[model samples]
Target: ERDCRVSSFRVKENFDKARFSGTWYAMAKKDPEGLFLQDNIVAEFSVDETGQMSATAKGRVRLLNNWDVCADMVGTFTDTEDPAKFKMKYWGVASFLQKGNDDHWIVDTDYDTYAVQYSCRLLNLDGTCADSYSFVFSRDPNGLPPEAQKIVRQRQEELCLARQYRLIVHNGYC
Candidate 1:
């Protein structure tokens, strides 16, 4: 409905991988056009000695064919000119996981309480986003603080992705 261009976005400042390395829980998400990772999602970020950022993510996925299970996936980030931007190459540890290279940008984060990660899979021919996802990740698995919630929600609205998010329940089923 609005101009959903990636160029119009703002990335986090002074992105430090050391401070970001930790476990993050998906509190809410604005999913891409098609079905992908679902609830009970958890991702652990780490920076290796070589200063490469990598992550291992687990989430529940239900396919149209009635296939359902917890999935284990891995991602390696290739840094861009911007410290908060990266090209992520992600794949399932097994054959069942989704895999691709996506635009991974750290839109906002405190690196303690909450973080907002955005990815635009494709730019539609119409100058609109074809496939994009934004994740509100919390250090706390249960939920986020009221203060953090306000900021994250504001970002969602700013991205014109209001009402696009549904709560990601962590049932430990994964």
Candidate 2:
């Protein structure tokens, strides 16, 4: 498991959680297999006085017989030695929804306009990640600006997750 060094994953330097606090739209996402949230995903992030990161997220989820419901979830992030890396414990408001502890990494961000975040839920025996997810978040629900989009696309390629993203639609459903 030592082969795939955690150090190989780069994160934002001088990441400021205080400045990053706000509502963000999930403009695009590269979700791992068995994804639950369909679309219209939105997340709000905030930091407490103690420098703890917390989040509230919502998205449309399908139920049995094609019924759709907006699911609300919450998470608290525990910081790692790396400023931009965290261990997040997340769960749905309702017990039947989603709940897990996972890696949360801020790969890149402008703090105001756009951000690229990544998470991996499972680690392979060889130390490789499995069931990973990455998100492209923007202050604007419409989309990211050209410069930010370019940076996001480039980072996706650098992460070897190029072309894995799909547009996350928001239709006022959630």
**Top candidate when judged by lDDT against the true structure:** 1
Question: Taking the tens digit of each residue's C-alpha lDDT, what string does model 1 give over 62-141?
Answer: 88888888889999999989999999999998975678899899999999999999888888786567788989999999
> Clashing residue pairs in candidate 1, if any?
none
Give per-model TM-scores: 0.94, 0.92
- Predicted candidate 1, C-alpha RMSD: 1.6
- Write candidate 2's Cα lDDT for 115-146 as tens digits: 99988777766556766789999999999989
Model 2, residue 171: displacement in angstroms?
A: 0.7
Whole-model lDDT values for every prediction = 0.89, 0.87
Residue-level lDDT for 141 in candidate 1: 91
Looking at candidate 1, the ten consecutive residues that score lowest on lDDT are: 1-10
Misplaced by over 4 Å in model 2 are 1-7, 125-127
Clashes of each: 0, 0
> What is the Å distance of residue 170 in model 2 from its true position?
0.8
